[model samples]
Target chain A: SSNTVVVYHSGYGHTHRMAEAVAEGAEATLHAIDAEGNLSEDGWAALDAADAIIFGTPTYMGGPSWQFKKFADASSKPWFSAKWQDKVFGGFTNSASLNGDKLNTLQYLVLLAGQHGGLWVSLGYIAPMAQSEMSVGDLETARLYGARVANVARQHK
Target chain B: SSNTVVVYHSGYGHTHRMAEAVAEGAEATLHAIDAEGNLSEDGWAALDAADAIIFGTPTYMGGPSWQFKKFADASSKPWFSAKWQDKVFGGFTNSASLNGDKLNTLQYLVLLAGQHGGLWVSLGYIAPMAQSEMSVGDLETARLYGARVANVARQHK
Candidate 1:
């Protein structure tokens, strides 16, 4: 299998759409870890087969949805065995509010990848400063987010 | 001077507590990002010298205090130059409410750090499942969170 897989969990599917954008730009496989907070056998196999992994999740409460954490906790098995070592990792997240603190989820994802001995990726695009009181940023940030992930992944690849 | 420092502005001292905790854990320098959110040139120097950095802020109205974001805005100089690339990073937050989405402040920190090529650190603890009472549970969890950040920082050091 080609490298780079996006494995994510979405409750209402809004975050999943963002995941789709990433998958399209990443030219990478998409594997949705089901509600059991566990990856399918195939998904795990794809992970073993990929070069980088990206995670997506809705910012629920203050961090990742418990379901995703359950999945992260369950990964202890692979984590102990170093299944995703030295491979790159990155993540994206969204929330209904403008300042949903999606970065916490990204940081959560990055750290989880770190625990597994993986390299982490970031959304390198900058959010412009709009000084006017009338300014409003759009969801276009996510598109740039996807592009940055793809662009960086391509560099490493 | 070390390569990194933490400068935070807290409205009611919650973020300040987190700042001290993270500083004690990192044994690194510390500064105040200022109420206007402008970090002085010397403040910039503290961040530039270190190979790592961490941020702390209080959550306000589901986002970071405006002062914190102001500091983030003023950091555009370093952001554009990528002056903080490859630096190890971590963050913490505190709020009156437990689920104040402190993660939002931290997420902002992660994204800001990302713009500078900085990496992130995570709480390296298993959720401190104490199998005990609630108040005690929270206290134990706090310590676990603190130690977790310290533990991860050790890895980068």
Candidate 2:
């Protein structure tokens, strides 16, 4: 069985809902970065064991949230030891603006995966959210993206 | 005079030195994001008044440091007001790895500039830093990038 982990940070509840949809579709574990921008030891262990890792974060100020970036920086611990090397990776981002620079956040996730010597799974699309709520179509896309990432991991394994 | 502001976060002294070279070449004001991912009101004001803005940060993992992201997120205030519309922007990044995903950082900067409806000034090249110290040639490139950004702003003004 391929284990997939969705690691994310949500400022409002929008990204969290998107993450939930993605997690549900992937049948994956959900690890949330806290307000303090930290994950639990268990979360780290889960990631270390995951066959696929999906990064999700809200686009804030044209990029990923500071909290998410904090988590990414801390990943250097895993990076130094090549703990995540060769894993399948994917990412999704949410933002209020239609063109909220969400692509930049997603691109950062791809780069992080590359730095870990991992292969990336593309979403085949981008997802954007409204201020009050996420669009149903966008949520569906996120869910499908999660499934795609897991499927890729399964194939790779 | 073309007022240019260099807002940056340096985890180590390497990015700071690069920022200094850029600042010298542009005769720009330096605004450093604090370790806690916060910037001063004075720095905010400088960015608003500047004809050109340059972003600098160390690529901690695969992207800019969390502190710099925090500052970028905070810039939403100016973004909402279109306070930076049509302004000139440029960015530079330093990292230990030769292909340390520095382009990701620069691309994020460009996206942020786009979000503000601003024009971006390309470095004419990318700059990477060595482990112990930054190369003198890389520093020169940063300096030239700063000069180019300032010159672009002058022309626009």
Candidate 3:
């Protein structure tokens, strides 16, 4: 069976909402990264067993929050052994302003997936290149990406 | 008169080479982020006094190294008071892989500058994005971005 898990940290409520939207759209399990930057053993197990792992985080200052970075740092353990390789990956981020450079956060996720030798799933639709006033929900970037992730991950396994 | 400083951390020597290119191009003061993830009191003081601060960090796990993130976390003091507000900002990064998502690191720098309410300066030339096997220098991404940064920064203040 294709099991997808969404791993995320919300700096504020904005990213949390984004995570929920993704979860709802994907029908995926949700794992919240803690304030101290940790995932429970269960969370690790979920990711390990998952066919897809979607990363979500608030774009603070231009990248994912420190908590998410911590998660990435901890991932070095899995990375050393190539445990998560070939898994399907996707990501989303929210920031307060238009052109918050939120792409940076998404790019970070894509590369994290790369480090794990995982396959990245891009947002099927491109958001407008120029900065805009649309919030993450308005464009449904996270939601559609979530749905896309689910659809894609199912094809692999 | 204009003062520019380049503050960076190199995971390996690769990022250091790019930092040198940026500094040489900008005629910028260079400050290295130590292995312990710290800058001296004088380093902090220089950042406070500079007209511009250019950030550098090697891309690690799809983002800036943890040491650079450590420095960023420590920057909240200035962020609280907006001490760096309106200061010019620019950044450059490198990674072992061409598509190591270096832009994410650059975006991280831009947002860090924004958190301080500083202005972001862009690299004059945009390079095509793709995953490739080019070494950091052969592609000339950092060198041009560095040179372009100095030229753009001078016009602002």
Candidate 4:
């Protein structure tokens, strides 16, 4: 079993709401994306200790806003030394408008994690097949994605 | 307009081959993502100045490897500072297995970009998903993907 941590950037609060839901079920530590657009060193340490890490963000244009990407790019020190190999990773993103291409953003995050040599928790929670209404599962779903990762956390060993 | 930055970590030369195509197509400067994986202090300055960023990685184990995730986690500094807020973002991942769940990896990257508050570019160019073509026209399609970025880059204003 593993401990899961929830890290997110909440632009309009929708993404924050999702972060809250994830923390609720997984009992994960919730780290805000914050106004300064900075992630805490404490958060990074937690990610290293945890068995799984889940991310949340707001979709800006076709993908995530720059606030989130900077964090990814900044993670290089740990990456340089191979601090987070074989960890489980998952992520979610929301946008004010539909067709924010949230999935595209998710793809970006996942590969970033993939580059880390982490085991990714493919979003398995399924929502109804609606282009419009998405539940909290898999790529499109939010909060429930938290629960999905929670399930994976215990299996990380 | 956005300053486009193409950053990638290539192992076994496959991804680097694609990176050249991506850089040439986007008409952007290329930064070979180093073993350190941390975007340099200068790199951060450059990204802060850019309106667009492109990430490239090789797919492994249904996701990006750990070196990339370390980079993602390290991005907290910029995420804390909100360094990347409205940039455009896009990414590419290649794997030996065609369906090696490559799309899943791309979705992962797109989501990371979303968290950063950036826009994403799509593979507007059609995939060579022709039925009769055997041995996969990977390079041909990759070339077109690069062109797709170029097409959007012209709209950077």
Which candidate wins on TM-score?
A: 2
- The number of the candidate with the highest lDDT is 2
DockQ of each: 0.10, 0.75, 0.38, 0.06
Look at candidate 1 and give me any clashing residue pairs: B3-B49, B3-B50, B4-B50
TM-score of each: 0.56, 0.89, 0.69, 0.50
Candidate 2 lDDT by residue in tens digits, A42-147: 9899999999998889888878899999999999999999999999998888877755467777777878898899998876653323333677887887888888
**Alpha-carbon RMSD, each predicted model:** 8.6, 2.6, 5.6, 10.0
TM-score of chain A, cand. 1 = 0.81
- Using TM-score, rank the candidates from best to worst: 2, 3, 1, 4
- The CA lDDT of each predicted structure is 0.63, 0.84, 0.75, 0.65
Residue A74: error of model 2 in Å?
Answer: 0.8
Per-residue lDDT tens digits for candidate 4, residues A8-48, read 88766767766776677677898776744578888888878
Better of 1 and 3 by TM-score: 3
**Candidate 1, what DockQ?**
0.10
Interface RMSD of each: 6.0, 1.1, 2.1, 9.4
- Per-residue lDDT of candidate 4, residues B31-113 (tens digit): 76666455666766776776677777766544554355445655656776778876677787776665545666576677677
Q: What C-alpha lDDT, on a 0 to 100 scale, does residue B117 get in candidate 4? A: 72
Instruction: Please give the lDDT score at residue B83 for candidate 1.
Output: 81
Fnat by candidate, in order = 0.10, 0.93, 0.47, 0.00
Clashing pairs in 3: A61-B111
- Per-residue lDDT of candidate 3, residues B1-157 (tens digit): 5788888887766667777777777778889888756888888988898888888777777778877886887787878778898888888776767554666676677778877888877756222122223365533655566566666667776
Model 1 over residues A1-157: C-alpha lDDT tens digits?
2366888888777767767767776677888877768789898888777777778777777688887898889888888887876566777776665444555566677668767765455555222111111212323545455455555445444
C-alpha lDDT of residue B37 in model 2: 85
What ordering of candidates by DockQ runs from best to worst?
2, 3, 1, 4
